[PDB]
């Protein structure tokens, strides 16, 4: 595979700057790069197809090799040279599905496909070019146990999950007290609810926790905080716990008072944040504490009057609310995100030929349940795979 | 060199750098009490030795920890640090009429 | 095109590495190829201009060649290399202004500029290098006829489209059943609402749907569902279309029930995603359909049964709704979307020199215009303006 | 500056380059500068750290040349070069973070520490191979005294501001009319109000004018106008201007009239735009003016005329609003955004070491207060952390 | 790293290998590898301690070499040799020490200690003895990125934790029905307690469930299954849920039936056994879930008569309980044992020197704390203090 | 010897000790604040006692470094001394304990037994080395 | 059987000695036995799988014998040398996996599979290093 | 570092030396006045200055 990536960005090279006009020297070490291939390539027999619809292709190379004479390209050595790039791109292509449409438990690091199987060993080491983009590099470097990460924006790593929780209540739904959250995608929103308005609280307060799980660390992640939930404002219904009955919600905002970010590593709280919005910084997190509380105004106007009885019959919902959303991260293991092909790649090329699902990745490749299970195992199949993507991605145009 | 004892039925003696402890002696202590300045002890040997060995000293720590400061004592609370919440509360404890 | 991309990345490459005591070793082939476009500038005169505010400009080359003898640059042989280069700056600003200005309804995927026009000479020709802008390499591979796509974050393939359409209404719109979309940039709000409340057609449910067409087709795109539709759902006041009077809408929003999203082609089924919200790909598509149906509580409380009375006049009204985000996506075209600094560019050079607006773009050209009237002979306007424009950003921050 | 910066692309360039195999003749240069790098560096001593708690580390460097004549790059060059790059990588790992957190009240744009000014002096302008990086091009080009640019995506220029003004109070808060924005990242959500629709203003009509400034110039803006503000149609009880009690904002919506958004640079008109919505380009400005409209239906079906009461008491407040989204820009300095994670890694480092409060930025880096006194001092300073923040981040992510 | 390794067991070879007497051949090589290592290690100046508080320590080398023609061993040459022998020992206890504290949030692949660091310079990877025990195997097996892991008696995995789940009670605490259970280590002993004798539950049946979540992948281990629970049979008061007073348990025991033992991976069933005790395998699993059930009898005795009531007044509860202890496995992630002193010494050195404390660790190494949040960066960190108080462990006690 | 070398206060699950020659085990029985009825019955004010109360603790030593030899758990040196003695039916010398029983062979340590002891573990370890 | 210990403890020895920078000498011995089991294990052809869901594996040995230009390792001959040993321990794998599923009644001293009974032949017998497990 | 709070809502920061003027951090105000001893700002930072 890495000497798949070789072939991809070489070949990516040839289309990029093999062009009518051009210096022999501005593309020396390209020529005497690609030659060196049409070296070990002539003579070498590839299978592929055998699995999903990916149909049985055998592939020889007996392609001559490129002038090197001539000093200023014109349209003959380019097209001469066009005719079997076309045909390298698509064995390129081929090999790229072949190595996508397959998983392992037995260790994902190897590689997968009898094709790249024999291609790894010494015959043909001397496939390379260089590296220049992150995957390829993260590859190489995470092989070797150095130092890395990719860079992401906006990405999910929070499983799209939206409930809520209940302290206070009975059937009859006149008197409720608790928290909705709603982490999907990036976005996180969280919203403590009362209907008491603290008439029964020790002084007028009361608490709301919440806590999430990441399913892998982030490190030095930038993310913004705003001191409301643009999401939970409406009047609305929602089912029981038990989908028997239905119940009413018609909220009303205030403002929250100590409001309380904790960003948390292994129970040590790295990053401490006391009511400041905007964005803020997490050099190093993987567990997220939000706490505040639901304090009842001390002076009071008419319409708030109104609104919030000592007595007994309710009419409206007091709300505190907060809002969260990430937009980048350095990261140690690859994530979907809003930048990238990649899941859509694999995705697409699984569903060009109908692959039946195998033991570890998800039915059609749906991203919550795959998120939801994330395993070892998971990631080296994850991370390979998308190193696959990326090489299909670095060539399809 | 500080030495420490209490009604509790113990005895300790030991050095400011490192709380290593130092076999006692009785007559040097009676004199150093009897003139030099008390300090009243709030964080006993145990709570100190212990401190030592799972958290972080620094000298000046030590200078404050052994002066029994407030700044010491108030940031180690608020650090949740478990150790010397469990011998506050036992004091609390012992406060019970 | 081509030749000016040519002029401009490698003033971006020189004048980002022609600077005193660093090696010569390091940059003699580029100096190669300042010489070879020294050679094939002197001599000549060239004109840029003629319209708008934009003074006539005349411009000569006179410049020595470069010098090679030294083993380190020193500061003065920069120092000629910078004055060269500002004129060159001005040259490549100056003909890509004229280009970005001049157009016509006929043949508007070839120059428009004396200057480039010129440029377009086989002589003029040879001073290549490579193409490594994204822009560049799709504009060559457009002019060899083969598939190409753009990576856009937030396309803006959506015209401002917010309409609503009414299933049933009345003098004083108090039975009232349609359907709300708001359609700007990428973000999909649509919303249906009736105010029976699901009491009068068969199986006490009332179907929704919505379409959504394309006039281009997009490819890995990934796609955010947020199950609710957040701008129509509050109080509201609007006007009716024939604007005899205005209706109220006081909304209470439910449960989405068996949502369908279709993304189609030519109106057949590629990607189908049912019961399920969160994020997803579209690997090609290009046409959106959201179904879904208010499914009135079989079961309720006492507030939720005086929220809906099963008589005629209604107080309350039910509406639900989806939301759709393309986070990023790939085109056959060029579009519009969430980071270029390019259609602006041109605008501003439009506006600044003030040409009168001609029937090439709507005056000031309205992007809602645009891709309301949405034409391939445009598009390859706006895919040549374009490449000038990132031709243009390339040299003058 | 540009020492380290250059070693840095040197060595990023090297390790992305040096691989197995591939023949002398496609890094022979690289080999050069590396070896080159090495001889100059030799015999030089260096110190880093002593504050916070970066520890102090010592640096010397007795390496020799690795030139070993070949034809194809073998093993023994991918360890001699790999250990040299670990070393190589630590060492400007460590002077770039002691570099950062150390800051000056004055000449923000000179080396802090004893190593960086050494790395200034003559005896080491011997190895400049190349500055390439839109960050090092304004560095060098802002020592030509020329045109700073930079380019981003969501600039959160707007810091943090929640603010709400009165133009008619009543102290039982029902005849309030007034203004109400939020500032957030880069989003300007602005809405008026009135509680009567002006049955006391002249003519039917209200106006209501919304002028905010910046913190710098600001030029090539890519904006979304949409005509419904998204926050500020909620049902909210919002406290007091005297802090001492609150009152019940009651929104319904109408349409905004007569919508006047313009862009003024020293005061003078240069952008407009009426009846627009949709997209608009932003050519040079400071101070962004909305002037809105509030006008009374001309009539009024049953439903809005039990809304609107002519007699006193009014329950439902009437509400305009608009939404100003800035989706990129060009500017004359460094901002933060969405996009170039700088921010986060700049706090990241003096974060973890627990540096005192740099005596210029305030405290915690609090991107609100940091932009609202964004001052010549804080101009330099921010420009040195954010240049060597994406120097460091070349190498370790 | 691996050279500490070759040093520790080159030491190790030079106090034993070497006495009194020997024929030159036997340890010619080692001694021919020592004057090697002794011409290596002088002619570095190194500073080892100022941490805590272990001291500076000035360090050089200057020693003769070895014998290299002998025909046997006399007393005059292991004379020579122990003096600067032991100093070596001294050094590398040092340099053990002085590693064994360290902390890196995002690092711990790459060494940290200074003469250490200085010491993995390639110019001293001249001293490789040989890698032959268990973790410096795995060490330069992880380098290379093969299948690794560690076989372990008694291994501690479980976190400590006492909890109970409660399925039916009331605040009388008269009618009990849930399950305790208690892990630790390598062992957990789970009970399910009943009230009522399953007298009012369907078919004369009632179940008990359990889950264990691991914290990491093991594979291939010994589980002695036993159906006798000991530590849940006797006369217990334990406190409330919630906590306002405590409540009493006097159970009986039964002999279970129906059981269900299963350990799965990453959501599915790997090992599935019914009612088979003593001694069972896994395979490839991180999920344990019990299934068991009692029976009221179908028949009875006086005194089983007298004790298994209809009635409300009960007074010997029933209990069923299951032990289930991993005696031995092999895994990937590092984990502290009950067969070395490893984490023994790690501690030791802790607390020796009092450590500046962060989150890289909780605070002292305190297992349980550790492994409930186990970590994949501290996993590096601990795994690299592990192989070097191995290394430690091989030399000096 | 009287020096404290380590301390806890309630720690629970697993601890490290650098160095000990003693141990100490010092812990509290309170009264629960309150009880429920079935609880305050085990629990009355007055003499007569029909339920005893108690707390327990369990001291696990899983792994240890000693500057004198020990019978240990993973070896098979003591087992196999012994059954040398016992092959061939020695009369007990006065240095060795009748029985050869590890505990009263411990309860007195003096040094000549940890002598002789060390000899015969190692020409047992020796012996072992040959009958695998 | 013995002949698979061999060349277990020969491969696990090898990945425990030969990696980058070591002494020709201290493994010197273990270079030539390598050679030797390069040599002797020249030519022939295993098979494995084709019981259960055991997969159907082929291999031959063209692994050439490694040379004798050494002062000390060099990452080049730790590939070529690597790249050879990862072959061998797959086959290793398959081999140990195609026996420990095997079976018998009254011969459980008599290697069982296919692949160790033709390695009870007559040439393997160099193959054969240390004994000390 | 030095730290001076007053009524009318005047608040400085600064350094002993060169007395520069320093931005305020509320949270080292609030860690800091809580138990240490306090003292009089017979002189402000003005007429320090």
Chains 1, 3, 4, 5 share one sequence.
Not at chain 1, 79 to 107: G, L, P
Not at chain 1, 208 to 235: Q, W, Y
Not at chain 1, 310 to 329: D, M, Y
């Amino acid at each position: 595979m890495d000497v798949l990536y070789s072939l991809s960005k070489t070949l990516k090279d040839a289309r990029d700057k093999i062009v009518e006009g051009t210096l022999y020297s501005n593309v020396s070490d390209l020529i005497q790069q690609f030659n060196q291939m049409i070296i070990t390539m002539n003579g070498n027999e590839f299978q592929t197809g055998g699995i999903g619809n990916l149909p049985i292709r055998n592939w020889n190379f007996n392609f001559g090799l490129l002038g090197t004479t001539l000093l200023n390209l014109d349209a003959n050595y380019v097209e001469t040279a066009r005719n079997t790039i076309d045909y390298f791109v698509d064995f390129v292509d081929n090999v790229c599905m072949d190595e996508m449409v397959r998983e392992s438990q037995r260790n994902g690091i190897a590689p997968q496909s009898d094709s790249l199987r024999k291609l790894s060993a010494i015959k043909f080491k001397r496939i390379n070019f260089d590296n220049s983009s992150e995957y390829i590099e993260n590859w190489n470097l995470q092989n070797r146990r150095q130092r890395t990460g990719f860079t992401f924006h906006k990405p999910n790593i929070f499983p799209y999950s939206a409930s809520f929780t209940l302290n206070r209540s009975q059937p009859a739904h006149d008197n409720l007290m608790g928290t909705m959250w709603l982490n999907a995608g990036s976005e996180i929103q969280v919203a403590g609810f009362d209907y008491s308005c603290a008439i029964n609280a020790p002084a007028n307060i009361q608490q709301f926790e919440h806590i999430v799980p990441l399913r892998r660390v982030l490190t030095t992640a930038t993310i913004t905080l705003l001191p409301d939930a643009e999401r939970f404002s409406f009047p609305r219904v929602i089912n029981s716990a038990d989908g028997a009955t239905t119940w009413f919600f018609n909220p009303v905002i205030l403002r929250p008072n100590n409001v309380e970010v904790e960003f948390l590593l292994n129970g040590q709280i790295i990053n401490t944040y006391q009511a400041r919005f905007g964005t803020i910084v997490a050099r190093n997190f993987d567990t997220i504490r939000l706490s505040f509380q639901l304090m009842r105004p001390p002076n009071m106007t008419p319409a708030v009057a109104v609104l919030f009885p000592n007595a007994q019959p309710f009419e409206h919902h007091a709300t505190v609310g907060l809002t969260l959303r990430i937009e980048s991260a350095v990261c140690e293991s690859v994530l979907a995100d809003a930048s990238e092909t990649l899941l859509a790649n694999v995705t697409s090329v699984r569903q060009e030929y109908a692959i039946p699902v195998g033991p570890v990745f998800p039915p059609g490749m749906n991203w919550t349940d795959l998120i939801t299970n994330y395993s070892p195992s998971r990631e080296d199949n994850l991370q390979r795979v998308f190193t696959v993507a990326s090489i299909r991605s670095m060539l399809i145009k | 060199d500080v030495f420490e004892a209490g009604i509790d039925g113990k005895f300790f003696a030991y050095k400011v750098d490192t709380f290593e402890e130092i076999p006692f002696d009785v007559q040097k202590f009676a004199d150093l009490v009897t003139d030099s300045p008390v300090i009243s002890a709030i964080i006993d040997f145990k709570t100190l030795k212990n401190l030592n060995d799972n958290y972080g000293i620094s000298r000046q720590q030590a200078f404050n920890l052994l002066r029994s400061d407030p700044r010491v004592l108030r940031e180690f609370i608020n650090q949740d640090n478990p150790i010397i919440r469990n011998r506050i509360e036992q004091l609390i404890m012992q406060c019970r009429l």
